[PDB]
CSV table of N, CA and C in Angstrom, one decimal:
chain,number,residue,atom,x,y,z
M,1,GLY,N,0.8,-1.2,0.0
M,1,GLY,CA,0.0,0.0,0.0
M,1,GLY,C,0.9,1.3,0.0
M,2,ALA,N,0.2,2.4,-0.2
M,2,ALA,CA,1.0,3.7,-0.3
M,2,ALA,C,1.0,4.3,1.1
M,3,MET,N,1.6,3.6,2.1
M,3,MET,CA,1.7,4.1,3.4
M,3,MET,C,3.2,4.4,3.7
M,4,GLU,N,3.9,3.3,4.1
M,4,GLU,CA,5.3,3.4,4.5
M,4,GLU,C,6.1,3.9,3.4
M,5,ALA,N,5.9,3.3,2.2
M,5,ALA,CA,6.6,3.6,1.0
M,5,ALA,C,6.4,5.1,0.6
M,6,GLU,N,5.2,5.5,0.6
M,6,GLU,CA,4.9,6.9,0.3
M,6,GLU,C,5.6,7.9,1.2
M,7,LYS,N,5.4,7.6,2.5
M,7,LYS,CA,6.0,8.5,3.5
M,7,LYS,C,7.5,8.7,3.3
M,8,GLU,N,8.2,7.6,3.1
M,8,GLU,CA,9.7,7.7,2.8
M,8,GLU,C,9.9,8.3,1.5
M,9,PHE,N,9.1,8.0,0.5
M,9,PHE,CA,9.2,8.6,-0.8
M,9,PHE,C,9.1,10.1,-0.8
M,10,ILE,N,8.3,10.6,0.0
M,10,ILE,CA,8.2,12.1,0.2
M,10,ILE,C,9.4,12.7,0.8
M,11,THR,N,10.0,11.9,1.8
M,11,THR,CA,11.1,12.4,2.5
M,11,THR,C,12.4,12.4,1.6
M,12,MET,N,12.5,11.3,0.8
M,12,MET,CA,13.7,11.2,-0.1
M,12,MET,C,13.6,12.2,-1.2
M,13,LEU,N,12.4,12.6,-1.5
M,13,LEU,CA,12.1,13.6,-2.5
M,13,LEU,C,12.7,14.9,-2.1
M,14,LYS,N,12.5,15.3,-0.8
M,14,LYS,CA,13.1,16.5,-0.2
M,14,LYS,C,14.6,16.4,-0.1
M,15,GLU,N,15.0,15.2,0.4
M,15,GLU,CA,16.4,14.9,0.6
M,15,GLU,C,17.2,14.9,-0.7
M,16,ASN,N,16.6,14.5,-1.8
M,16,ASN,CA,17.2,14.5,-3.1
M,16,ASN,C,17.1,15.8,-3.8
M,17,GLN,N,16.6,16.8,-3.0
M,17,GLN,CA,16.5,18.2,-3.4
M,17,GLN,C,15.6,18.4,-4.6
M,18,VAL,N,14.6,17.5,-4.7
M,18,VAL,CA,13.6,17.5,-5.9
M,18,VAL,C,12.6,18.7,-5.7
M,19,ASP,N,12.3,19.3,-6.8
M,19,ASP,CA,11.2,20.3,-6.8
M,19,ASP,C,10.7,20.4,-8.2
M,20,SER,N,10.0,21.5,-8.5
M,20,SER,CA,9.3,21.7,-9.8
M,20,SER,C,10.3,21.7,-10.9
M,21,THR,N,11.6,22.0,-10.7
M,21,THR,CA,12.6,22.0,-11.8
M,21,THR,C,13.2,20.7,-12.0
M,22,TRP,N,12.3,19.6,-12.0
M,22,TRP,CA,12.7,18.2,-12.2
M,22,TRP,C,11.8,17.5,-13.1
M,23,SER,N,12.4,16.6,-13.9
M,23,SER,CA,11.6,15.6,-14.7
M,23,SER,C,11.6,14.3,-14.0
M,24,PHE,N,10.7,13.4,-14.5
M,24,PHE,CA,10.7,12.0,-13.8
M,24,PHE,C,11.8,11.1,-14.5
M,25,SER,N,12.7,11.8,-15.1
M,25,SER,CA,13.9,11.2,-15.7
M,25,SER,C,15.0,11.4,-14.6
M,26,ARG,N,15.0,12.5,-14.0
M,26,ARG,CA,15.9,12.9,-13.0
M,26,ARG,C,15.6,12.0,-11.8
M,27,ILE,N,14.3,11.7,-11.6
M,27,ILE,CA,13.9,10.8,-10.5
M,27,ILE,C,14.5,9.4,-10.8
M,28,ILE,N,14.3,8.8,-11.9
M,28,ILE,CA,14.8,7.5,-12.2
M,28,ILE,C,16.4,7.5,-12.2
M,29,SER,N,17.0,8.6,-12.6
M,29,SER,CA,18.4,8.7,-12.8
M,29,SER,C,19.1,9.0,-11.5
M,30,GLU,N,18.6,9.9,-10.7
M,30,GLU,CA,19.2,10.4,-9.5
M,30,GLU,C,18.7,9.7,-8.2
M,31,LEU,N,17.4,9.4,-8.2
M,31,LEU,CA,16.7,8.8,-7.0
M,31,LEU,C,16.8,7.3,-7.1
M,32,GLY,N,17.2,6.8,-8.2
M,32,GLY,CA,17.4,5.4,-8.4
M,32,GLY,C,18.8,5.0,-7.9
M,33,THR,N,19.6,5.9,-7.5
M,33,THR,CA,21.0,5.7,-7.1
M,33,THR,C,21.3,6.3,-5.7
M,34,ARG,N,20.8,7.5,-5.5
M,34,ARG,CA,21.1,8.2,-4.2
M,34,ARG,C,20.8,7.4,-3.0
M,35,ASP,N,19.7,6.8,-3.0
M,35,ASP,CA,19.3,5.8,-1.9
M,35,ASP,C,18.3,4.9,-2.5
M,36,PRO,N,18.4,3.6,-2.1
M,36,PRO,CA,17.6,2.5,-2.7
M,36,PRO,C,16.1,2.5,-2.2
M,37,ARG,N,15.6,3.7,-1.7
M,37,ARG,CA,14.3,3.8,-1.3
M,37,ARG,C,13.3,3.7,-2.5
M,38,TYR,N,13.9,4.2,-3.6
M,38,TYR,CA,13.1,4.1,-4.9
M,38,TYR,C,12.9,2.7,-5.3
M,39,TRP,N,13.6,1.8,-4.8
M,39,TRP,CA,13.5,0.4,-5.1
M,39,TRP,C,12.9,-0.4,-4.0
M,40,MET,N,13.0,0.1,-2.7
M,40,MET,CA,12.3,-0.5,-1.6
M,40,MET,C,10.8,-0.6,-1.9
M,41,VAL,N,10.3,0.5,-2.3
M,41,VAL,CA,8.9,0.5,-2.8
M,41,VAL,C,9.0,0.2,-4.3
M,42,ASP,N,8.3,-0.9,-4.7
M,42,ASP,CA,8.3,-1.4,-6.0
M,42,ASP,C,7.9,-0.4,-7.0
M,43,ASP,N,8.6,-0.4,-8.2
M,43,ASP,CA,8.5,0.6,-9.2
M,43,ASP,C,7.1,0.6,-9.9
M,44,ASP,N,6.2,1.4,-9.4
M,44,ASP,CA,5.0,1.7,-10.2
M,44,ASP,C,5.2,3.1,-10.8
M,45,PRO,N,5.6,3.2,-12.0
M,45,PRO,CA,6.0,4.4,-12.7
M,45,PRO,C,4.9,5.4,-12.8
M,46,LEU,N,3.7,4.8,-12.8
M,46,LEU,CA,2.5,5.7,-12.9
M,46,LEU,C,2.1,6.3,-11.6
M,47,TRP,N,2.3,5.5,-10.5
M,47,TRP,CA,2.0,6.0,-9.2
M,47,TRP,C,3.2,6.9,-8.8
M,48,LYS,N,4.4,6.5,-9.1
M,48,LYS,CA,5.6,7.4,-8.8
M,48,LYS,C,5.4,8.7,-9.5
M,49,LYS,N,4.8,8.7,-10.7
M,49,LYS,CA,4.7,9.9,-11.5
M,49,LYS,C,3.4,10.7,-11.1
M,50,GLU,N,2.4,10.0,-10.7
M,50,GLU,CA,1.2,10.6,-10.1
M,50,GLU,C,1.5,11.3,-8.8
M,51,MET,N,2.2,10.6,-8.0
M,51,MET,CA,2.6,11.2,-6.7
M,51,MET,C,3.6,12.3,-6.9
M,52,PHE,N,4.4,12.2,-8.0
M,52,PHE,CA,5.3,13.3,-8.3
M,52,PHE,C,4.5,14.5,-8.7
M,53,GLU,N,3.4,14.4,-9.4
M,53,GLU,CA,2.5,15.5,-9.7
M,53,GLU,C,2.0,16.1,-8.4
M,54,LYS,N,1.9,15.3,-7.4
M,54,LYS,CA,1.5,15.7,-6.0
M,54,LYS,C,2.7,16.5,-5.4
M,55,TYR,N,3.9,16.0,-5.6
M,55,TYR,CA,5.1,16.6,-5.1
M,55,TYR,C,5.4,17.9,-5.7
M,56,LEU,N,4.8,18.1,-6.9
M,56,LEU,CA,5.0,19.4,-7.6
M,56,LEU,C,3.9,20.4,-7.3
M,57,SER,N,2.7,19.8,-7.0
M,57,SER,CA,1.5,20.7,-6.7
M,57,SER,C,1.5,21.0,-5.2
M,58,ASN,N,1.6,19.9,-4.4
M,58,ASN,CA,1.5,20.0,-3.0
M,58,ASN,C,2.9,20.0,-2.4
M,59,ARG,N,3.7,19.0,-2.8
M,59,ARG,CA,5.1,18.8,-2.4
M,59,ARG,C,5.2,18.3,-1.0
């Protein structure tokens, strides 16, 4: 579910210094290596990208 995974995913997004000036390419390229949290939660690229739209709108 999108509980533990989402929570950490939001935190890693701040810690990876992600903001509006990012593509979901930079996520796969930088967040896929900086810390394996992007892999801890299984890769749903549509949810990762949906929630990324949340991280850009709400953050």
